[PDB]
Design a protein around this nucleic acid. Structure first.
Lengths: 162, 50, 48
RNA sequence: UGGCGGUAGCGU
DNA sequence: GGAAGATCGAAAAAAGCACGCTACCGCCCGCGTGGTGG
DNA sequence: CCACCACGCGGGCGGTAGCGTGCTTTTTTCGATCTTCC
């Protein structure tokens, strides 16, 4: 009788919504993947939810009504196609359970030997090659001069991705 | 004549119909319908005749 | 063109964003999110 | 020194 | 004698609601998150 | 160690629901009869 639903949650409130739904005694699921991020200047590895702002909740409407899940202090709404809320088949849940990926993540790609555009500092608007993360604050690029490119480490916030 | 037109013939059917009319797009359940009807009119929280 | 949706200065360090700029920002954000989601091979329900 | 939303007012 | 055209009223959705002018008020993304100075 | 000056991703807002609510005219659709037949 228990069934699965897709839930769209508010921005930056997935953990609180998940805790509340656990307090509602319903099953919760959200993919979790760790990776390196810029983190406003510190290229550190943290865990972000795959398919952000999406939760998969297993429960029974007869036991606990849908509107209770809708207004559980952190749930933006139900992902609904038509009048009734959408029902996700168990095959998708089974696939997501064994879903163990490895991805690069596009906007956090200061990878070694990768093209990066510097738009600040003495090398503003210049294309260079990230080649190794020097510590955390000041990543290291082959800064491009008119003659050639030279090893140099400058602040992470100076350059963005091409 | 209105009773003849009315298709519902029981309290549960009437509650389901009024719940569907009040909140479309949600699964009609007896508990939710009865709670909605009770809280709509006979509850002091959001209904209050001055 | 930008001049048809200008950001008039507010002489207070802020700018008055027009509704067109906000709508374009919404469209750009949603398009980027959809591209990222389809790049990650999201399930059918999420993609829809 | 640019826009709107609300309010009030003038002439019809 | 059941299916397709008629129609028929009943309901639902869209667009409009004068012109100039003047003055004041309020705002010009909000919010969870973060770093820094008193 | 606590108040307050940025900040950068989302979107109805807020809440373990509900909020709406004193117009007229024109156009479109739809259930319900109907009706008319092949």
């Amino acid at each position: 009788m228990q069934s699965w639903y897709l839930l769209y949650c508010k921005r930056g409130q997935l953990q609180r919504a998940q805790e509340h739904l656990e307090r509602q005694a319903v099953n919760c699921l959200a993919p979790m993947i760790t990776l390196e991020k810029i983190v406003r200047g510190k290229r550190t590895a943290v865990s972000e939810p795959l398919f952000p702002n999406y939760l998969f909740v297993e429960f029974d409407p007869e036991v606990i009504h849908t509107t209770t899940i809708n207004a559980t202090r952190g749930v933006s709404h139900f992902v609904r196609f038509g009048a009734s809320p959408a029902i996700v088949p168990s095959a998708v849940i089974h696939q997501l359970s064994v879903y163990k990926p490895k991805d690069i993540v596009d906007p956090a790609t200061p990878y070694p030997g990768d093209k990066v555009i510097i738009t600040e500092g003495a090398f503003e608007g210049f294309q260079a090659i990230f080649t190794e993360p020097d510590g955390e604050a000041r990543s290291m690029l082959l800064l491009n001069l008119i003659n050639k490119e030279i090893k140099h480490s400058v602040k992470n916030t100076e350059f963005r991705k091409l | 004549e209105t009773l003849r037109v009315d298709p519902t013939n029981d309290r549960l059917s009437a509650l389901v119909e009024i719940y569907r009319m009040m909140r479309p797009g949600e699964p009609p359940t007896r508990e939710a319908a009865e709670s909605l009807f009770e809280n709509l009119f006979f509850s002091e929280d959001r209904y209050d005749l001055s | 063109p930008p001049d048809l949706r200008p950001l008039v200065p507010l002489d207070g360090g802020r700018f008055a964003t027009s509704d067109l700029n906000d709508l374009y920002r919404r469209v750009i954000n949603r398009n980027n999110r959809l591209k990222r989601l389809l790049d990650l091979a999201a399930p059918d329900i999420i993609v829809r």
